[PDB]
Design an enzyme around this catalytic site. Sequence first.
Site, short mmCIF file in Angstrom:
data_model
loop_
_atom_site.label_atom_id
_atom_site.label_comp_id
_atom_site.label_asym_id
_atom_site.label_seq_id
_atom_site.Cartn_x
_atom_site.Cartn_y
_atom_site.Cartn_z
N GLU A 67 -33.71 -6.98 59.62
CA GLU A 67 -33.50 -5.62 60.19
C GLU A 67 -32.01 -5.40 60.44
OE1 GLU A 67 -36.11 -3.19 60.64
OE2 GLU A 67 -36.97 -4.70 59.31
N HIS B 188 -49.74 3.41 47.43
CA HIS B 188 -48.52 4.08 46.87
C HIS B 188 -48.95 5.13 45.85
CE1 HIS B 188 -46.01 0.77 48.51
NE2 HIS B 188 -47.24 0.25 48.52
#
Lengths: 67, 126, 711, 72
Positions: free
Chosen positions: C356, C486
């Site tokens: 992150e 997706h």
Amino acid sequence: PDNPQECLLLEPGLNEIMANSLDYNERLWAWESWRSEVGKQLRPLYEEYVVLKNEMARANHYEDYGD
Amino acid sequence: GWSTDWSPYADQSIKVRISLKSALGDKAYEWNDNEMYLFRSSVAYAMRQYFLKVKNQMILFGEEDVRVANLKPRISFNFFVTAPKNVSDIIPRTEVEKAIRMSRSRINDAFRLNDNSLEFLGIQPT
Amino acid sequence: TIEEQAKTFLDKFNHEAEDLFYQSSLASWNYNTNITEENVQNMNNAGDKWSAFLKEQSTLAQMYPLQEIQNLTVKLQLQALQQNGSSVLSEDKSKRLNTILNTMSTIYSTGKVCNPDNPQECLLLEPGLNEIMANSLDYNERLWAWESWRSEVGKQLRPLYEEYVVLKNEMARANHYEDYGDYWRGDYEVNGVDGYDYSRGQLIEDVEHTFEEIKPLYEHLHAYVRAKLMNAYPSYISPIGCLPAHLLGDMWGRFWTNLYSLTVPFGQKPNIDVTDAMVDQAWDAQRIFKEAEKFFVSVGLPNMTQGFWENSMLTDPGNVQKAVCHPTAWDLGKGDFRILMCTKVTMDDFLTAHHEMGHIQYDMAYAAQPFLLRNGANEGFHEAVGEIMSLSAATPKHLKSIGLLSPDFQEDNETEINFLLKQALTIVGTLPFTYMLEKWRWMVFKGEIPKDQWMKKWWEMKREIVGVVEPVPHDETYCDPASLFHVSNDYSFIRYYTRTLYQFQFQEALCQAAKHEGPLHKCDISNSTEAGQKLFNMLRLGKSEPWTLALENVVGAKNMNVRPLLNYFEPLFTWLKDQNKNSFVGWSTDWSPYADQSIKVRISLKSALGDKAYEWNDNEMYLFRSSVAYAMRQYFLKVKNQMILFGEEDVRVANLKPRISFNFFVTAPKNVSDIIPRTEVEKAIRMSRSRINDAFRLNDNSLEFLGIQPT
Amino acid sequence: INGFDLPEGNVTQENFVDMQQRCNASDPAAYAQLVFQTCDINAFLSEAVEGTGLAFIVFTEAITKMPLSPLW
Ligand SMILES: *[C@@H]1O[C@H](CO)[C@@H](O[C@@H]2O[C@H](CO)[C@@H](O)[C@H](O)[C@H]2NC(C)=O)[C@H](O)[C@H]1NC(C)=O
Ligand SMILES: *[C@@H]1O[C@H](CO)[C@@H](O[C@@H]2O[C@H](CO)[C@@H](O)[C@H](O)[C@H]2NC(C)=O)[C@H](O)[C@H]1NC(C)=O
Ligand SMILES: *[C@@H]1O[C@H](CO)[C@@H](O[C@@H]2O[C@H](CO)[C@@H](O)[C@H](O)[C@H]2NC(C)=O)[C@H](O)[C@H]1NC(C)=O
Ligand SMILES: *[C@@H]1O[C@H](CO)[C@@H](O[C@@H]2O[C@H](CO)[C@@H](O)[C@H](O)[C@H]2NC(C)=O)[C@H](O)[C@H]1NC(C)=O
Ligand SMILES: *[C@@H]1O[C@H](CO)[C@@H](O[C@@H]2O[C@H](CO)[C@@H](O)[C@H](O)[C@H]2NC(C)=O)[C@H](O)[C@H]1NC(C)=O
Ligand SMILES: *[C@@H]1O[C@H](CO)[C@@H](O[C@@H]2O[C@H](CO)[C@@H](O)[C@H](O)[C@H]2NC(C)=O)[C@H](O)[C@H]1NC(C)=O
Ligand SMILES: *[C@@H]1O[C@H](CO)[C@@H](O[C@@H]2O[C@H](CO)[C@@H](O)[C@H](O)[C@H]2NC(C)=O)[C@H](O)[C@H]1NC(C)=O
Ligand SMILES: CCNC(=O)CCc1cccc(Br)c1
């Protein structure tokens, strides 16, 4: 039948239709669908239930579960 | 009072008489639930053909859409067809008669019967 | 100026955008950490205002063209606003497309699979079907969940996807694009930058070429996993055939990570888990974040902005208020960087911190770029950066130096093979899946694959590229691709493929700068300022320059190369080839889990019926399955005295040919796992063969049930 | 037509040899295994019968492929 994601139980969804809905088609759907989905699931169980219930009452000195 | 004969589905119901022994005599198979299952499937096949040909409509009719009633040891029964997933949508007897007419031969073939033995009351040869 | 007024518009937009955008980003951050209905409306209003602004600016951008524009910076920003998208489609078309999208997403998100035994018990994908496909090892249970998922949501998505593809293609063509696939391939395409120019079709060529390079390594991985799958699922995997799709460790078989449990190279050898040492050293989410910060500073990348530390959800709220726990590197903009996640004292959380904060590093680096040039060079650049960060932190050396791993620790080659195989299950495993999915979608959008062959080519490609076979045949009524998230939620996938290549290129390049002398698999780019410089070169670049040039900024190349990925798995590769020395490496595109009980049936009409021969259509096929169901019912009720309600749906027909040849296998009325044996089926066939012939006006000669011999 | 699942009646005397090689090119491995007899009409005529076979093997067979076989 249109949206499979919206599934009504009897207590609120099917009951409100059968109590309020004035649409022949909608009412027919609820009625028929209830018997077709749940009523079939109870058929075999109810059959066994009858047999066992009669046995018990007969053994409790009764003609049948009705008696 | 009421008459215990009127039904909401009687209007579009086609009565069907079946005469196995008339057309078969010996080796005449017993009409069971399986024969009935086959019949409902045969009617569904016809409805599909009629719709896809006359209406060019690919409607997926199944044996479940074929609603049979008043089954008798004469092998007579009353059936009506509904929309593939709409109990309310009852296919009008006119369309059903046309569908039968179109595939009647095929249905007769499936039960080794003929117009005479496979009496589709209201449908007739010409 | 035209170029000057274009710049003027962009400048005005950038200033206003930054603030308007800040509101939206901040608003969402507030709700994401608050999860309050009040904050719901707040972010909603901010988003609408921000989106509306962008729309207005898009119209203004149109006025000024791109041809007379010479400065790349202004030109790029103008192109990034001038994009019309679905606006090009008519209001009605756009609204319908939106409805299609919403319906597809809703079906996927709220679709339920009821247990056949008890209809009252119904499992959704995320909570139930996922815990089966990921945990349940029962062949029957796994098959049930897999088949039911495609037999319900996938079928509902089938018609939606079809319309979706049409509207998307319209929009792309109206936006001057070959197809919706060409629309997506525009991301990498680079124009007017000499020695960096890229093409949408070039992307396809590059991906295909690189896929061939990884082909051999995947082949050995498949062969090894195949052997293990055979042991886990005896009499379910053939050593020369493909792999049943319902045994790949997840619903779509995208990753093989769950198979690690049954495919572990050295069971006796465990994996380094500092989640305990961390707790022993009283480590904390804040601690691991500081360690991530120190990791970056070790390679020269700057320390986390003090403000970030002030405004970052680095743990679970666990109070009256709740917050989203999903790791997120927030960039509110106007110099505002934050991280939202319910992180704990876990080795995974430690690595996630590096991942992150690595994204934050990229965000901070390109933060000076124009508002429209503050983003990763391409879609696969930002995620790749995050990946290499976590990789370097995961290195035992990093853990050992940080005290998480004992200095006395000894990394056995067996433990290293264990590590490498686990990574191959997550990486090399997804490469064929990702390649084949994008190839299929690209072909579908450009019309290479006709709608009548969508499912046909889907499973052909699956059997060939991925070496995976469907446990049950799926006709065009099924939409297996749409059953994936997706596809159902309109997202590109080639990003994942390209990212994987980029990541390894980046890691290897940084390793070269770090002067790493060990295997790339155990390369630690920590304490490498020079490597940080290379990474930073592309980091600070943002979207101002082409991705190919950004690749040169770090990796020093233009196009993606899979050689570094292969190099990383080279140790594992040697081991795999060693393990697959005795075994067959490859797969048969002909093997099927249902072929054994499949009865081939040739229907001859011109031979028998000749003139007035009925045409075999879907209704003819409907009649056939119904006829087979009839025979099965009769056979069971008579020979076995079992009234079984066989249905045409239980008749699983396959390999339909213009000769009217096909293969069918009967199954249980409500149990896909229960497939009726060919022997019993042949008995049923023979019993009603006459009746079947009658139904089609055919005969034993015309109606050939191959293997069922007429007497 | 079997080894290649060709639509029944797609291949005729008019298009046998071109569909032999065509299908060969399409799938030679799945064509080589096919076995074809040397069906030449001329040979069938030069196929003489020995002994009494012209009455009890040639005429008696040809009669069975002629309607009114019993009369014939
Ligand atoms: C309830 O249980 C008792 C216990 O067996 C039953 O009493 C018996 O009944 C049968 C039939 O009348 C006699 O042959 C036994 O000798 C009785 N045994 C005892 C210990 O009482 C009683 O019948 C049961 N109740 C009913 C209504 O069936
Ligand atoms: C389901 O069936 C009912 C009954 O046929 C349909 O209701 C009628 O449908 C026709 C054709 O759509 C209309 O012309 C009538 O005006 C309708 N009104 C009635 C009978 O209520 C209904 O439309 C069908 N719904 C679906 C979902 O197919
Ligand atoms: C493209 O536009 C940018 C934006 O102004 C130009 O960058 C500037 O260059 C001048 C000259 O060195 C500086 O004084 C400005 O401060 C710069 N501004 C910004 C915001 O970058 C760039 O030079 C232009 N290049 C071309 C090709 O025209
Ligand atoms: C996006 O919209 C703009 C606005 O119309 C399009 O730009 C025009 O393109 C046509 C065709 O070359 C010209 O005749 C117009 O004069 C242009 N107008 C303006 C003001 O830009 C642009 O082509 C569209 N792009 C896409 C992606 O479809
Ligand atoms: C990166 O370099 C730093 C700088 O030395 C290392 O930090 C040290 O780690 C060792 C091992 O615990 C300590 O004995 C030193 O006192 C630490 N020094 C400082 C100044 O931090 C760090 O461990 C190195 N990381 C790697 C992967 O080698
Ligand atoms: C790790 O390395 C050792 C060292 O060679 C390997 O041990 C050998 O295994 C092979 C295969 O059974 C034997 O033929 C050798 O004689 C062994 N050598 C020694 C000295 O132990 C071990 O197999 C390797 N583990 C992995 C990663 O496959
Ligand atoms: C559905 O059918 C399958 C296959 O007939 C059943 O699974 C088999 O169960 C037996 C008994 O446990 C095992 O020995 C077989 O190995 C299983 N087959 C497979 C393919 O794994 C299954 O139990 C049945 N379930 C239901 C819903 O009736
Ligand atoms: C029974 C012995 N005879 C033969 O084989 C051939 C006879 C024969 C055949 C056809 C026409 C005539 Br005239 C004679």
